[PDB]
């Protein structure tokens, strides 16, 4: 009966992506002193359905100069990669109980850029090439910091399993002994998912649309849902990493309620962040992450290496 579990994992996150678009437009209007979409349905509840049907009855409009192989291969790979790393998340019991789920998340997150590169190179245009180059620079910036953030936060967990991450929260949150690393991790999740002020690929003022500027409707919606599943899942991962809740084996309802509310609040905070700051230049992206973030996280990494030896607090690996 794993098929039913897989379907119930993969369909409601797509529905969550659609209603994330709804509340995205609503809240993003609301801090701009205007209302959101509320004409189509009662408080605009039918906006995602109209958006989804509208993109799928348009014309795909494949370009002549585009190499059709990677042009048709990039969005499906993007949607699959945004979908395939949801499994090791404990919810409170994960789909697949992998001992090294952090490594799986890291490797499938490294794979997620390849759809952007193949969509940039497959379409023959200068804007797609510039978007691919900026995505490459964004990956250069964020990977070498994000790996060390995850390792140094994970050093008190004792193992790479995400199931044992819920055990460590039973006394106190790990955001209290690792609040600077929490700031580093939040900026890194801002940078990875390509959300403002770290967008730099789907630019409106710099480029037209960047990596998918030649992508018409149908294939374009896959990148949209992939990015929104990415941000929802990344906020769920941050919630599990730093603000893990109280788990009771006899009632999973408590933990589902708690992490759902916490991840929803973190996504609202992400929406709050994404439209209050100017967009960064991509030359200042590695003038910050390679210059200010890296020495600080090296110092904190060696501090978290030498800290359980200091206090005699070596965590168990099991």
């Amino acid at each position: 009966m794993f098929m039913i579990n897989v379907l119930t994992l993969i369909i409601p996150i797509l529905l969550a992506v659609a209603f994330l678009t709804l509340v995205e437009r609503k809240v993003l209007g609301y801090m701009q002193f205007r209302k959101g979409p509320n004409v189509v349905g009662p408080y605009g509840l039918l906006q995602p359905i109209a958006d989804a049907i509208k993109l799928f009855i348009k014309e795909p409009l494949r370009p002549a100069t585009s190499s059709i192989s990677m042009f048709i291969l990039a969005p499906i790979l993007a949607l699959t990669l945004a979908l395939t790393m949801w499994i090791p998340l404990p919810m409170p019991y994960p789909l697949i109980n992998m001992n090294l789920g952090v490594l799986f998340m890291l490797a499938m997150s490294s794979l997620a850029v390849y759809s952007i590169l193949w969509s940039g190179w497959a379409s023959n245009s200068k804007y797609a090439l510039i978007g691919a180059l900026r995505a490459v620079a964004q990956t250069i910036s964020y990977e070498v910091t994000l790996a060390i953030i995850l390792l140094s936060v994970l050093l008190m967990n004792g193992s790479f399993t995400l199931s044992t991450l819920i055990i460590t929260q039973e006394q106190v949150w790990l955001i209290f002994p690792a609040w600077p690393l929490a700031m580093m991790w939040f900026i890194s999740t801002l940078a990875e998912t390509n959300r403002a002020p770290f967008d730099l690929t789907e630019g409106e003022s710099e480029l037209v649309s960047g990596f998918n500027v030649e992508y018409a409707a149908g294939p374009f919606a896959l990148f949209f849902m992939a990015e929104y599943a990415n941000i929802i899942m990344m906020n769920i991962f941050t919630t599990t990493l730093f603000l893990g809740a109280f788990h009771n084996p006899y009632m999973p309802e408590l933990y589902t309620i708690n992490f759902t509310i916490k991840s929803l609040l973190l996504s609202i905070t992400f929406l709050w962040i994404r439209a209050s700051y100017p967009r960064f230049r991509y030359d200042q992206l590695m003038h910050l992450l390679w210059k200010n973030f890296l020495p600080l996280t090296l110092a904190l990494c060696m501090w978290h290496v030498s800290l359980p030896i200091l206090l005699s607090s070596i965590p168990p690996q099991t």
Partner: protein, 70 residues
């Protein structure tokens, strides 16, 4: 005659200079708050990791007792 005219006493003063509030704690206060939160988290993690090591030792010795029959 009737025409658009300011009143007899004129219009009131209008503010036209910059007014920034200047707010928040002093930097020593947030540094002390962060350091205290760090120390509290370190102490709690220390206690819970020691308890986890004790529980792991208990489970391992149960496994060692169970080994010969298996």
């Amino acid at each position: 005659v009737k025409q658009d005219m300011p009143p007899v006493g004129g219009y009131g003063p209008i503010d036209y200079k910059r007014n920034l509030p200047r707010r928040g704690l002093s930097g020593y206060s947030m540094f002390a708050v962060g350091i205290g939160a760090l120390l509290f988290g370190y102490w709690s993690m220390m206690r819970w990791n020691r308890e986890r090591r004790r529980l792991q030792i208990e489970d391992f010795e149960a496994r060692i007792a169970l080994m010969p029959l298996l």
